[PDB]
Amino acid sequence: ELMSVVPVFYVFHYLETGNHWNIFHSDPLIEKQKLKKKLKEGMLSIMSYRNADYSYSVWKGGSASTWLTAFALRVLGQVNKYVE
């Protein structure tokens, strides 16, 4: 569920930092919204794997893991520059 927000992000890390918003035949401010759409949809996908102590568990209802939390903080700590 974290691999559904990653390839939207590394496209958004390209068209914004490199400033390549001159490709689309549509309005580029509009197509930027649909990319920031999926970066906001995918942020919700691991809202459900978060425990009560704000810790991330691998399976649904399973025990918490230090591996996934470090991977949940790697992914979410990168979306912060583009989605609040």
Partner 1 sequence: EQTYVISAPKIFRVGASENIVIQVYGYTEAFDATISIKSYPDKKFSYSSGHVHLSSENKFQNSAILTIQPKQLPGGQNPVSYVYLEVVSKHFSKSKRMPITYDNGFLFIHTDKPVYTPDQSVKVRVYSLNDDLKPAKRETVLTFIDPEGSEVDMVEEIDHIGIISFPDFKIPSNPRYGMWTIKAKYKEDFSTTGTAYFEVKEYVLPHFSVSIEPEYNFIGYKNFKNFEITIKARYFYNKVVTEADVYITFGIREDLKDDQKEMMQTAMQNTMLINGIAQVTFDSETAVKELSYYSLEDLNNKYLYIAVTVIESTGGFSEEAEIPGIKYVLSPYKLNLVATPLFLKPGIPYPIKVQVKDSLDQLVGGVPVTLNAQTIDVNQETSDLDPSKSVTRVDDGVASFVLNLPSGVTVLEFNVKTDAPDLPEENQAREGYRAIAYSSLSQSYLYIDWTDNHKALLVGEHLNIIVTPKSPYIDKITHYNYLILSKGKIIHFGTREKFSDASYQSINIPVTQNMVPSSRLLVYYIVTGEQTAELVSDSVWLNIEEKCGNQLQVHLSPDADAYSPGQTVSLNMATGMDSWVALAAVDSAVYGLERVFQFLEKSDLGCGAGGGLNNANVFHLAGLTFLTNANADDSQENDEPCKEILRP
Nearer to partner 1, 18 or 53 (CB): 53
Q: Is 41 in the site for partner 1 (CB under 8 A)?
A: yes
Q: CA-to-CA distance for 80 and 62, rounded, in angstroms? A: 27
Stretch that binds partner 1, among 10-18, 20-28, 46-54, 68-76 (CB under 8 A): 46-54
One-letter amino acid at 2 equals L
The last residues before gaps in the chain (C-N over 2.5 Å) are: none
CB neighbourhood size of 12 (10 A): 19
Instruction: State both tokens at 38.
Output: 């999926």
CB of 25 to partner 1, least distance (A): 22
Residue 29 CA, distance from chain mean position:
19
Q: Is 27 in the site for partner 1 (CB under 8 A)?
A: no
Candidate list 7, 17, 27, 44; residue touching partner 1; CB under 8 A = 44
Q: Under the rule (CB under 8 A), what is the footprint of partner 1? A: 1, 37, 40-41, 44-45, 47-49, 60
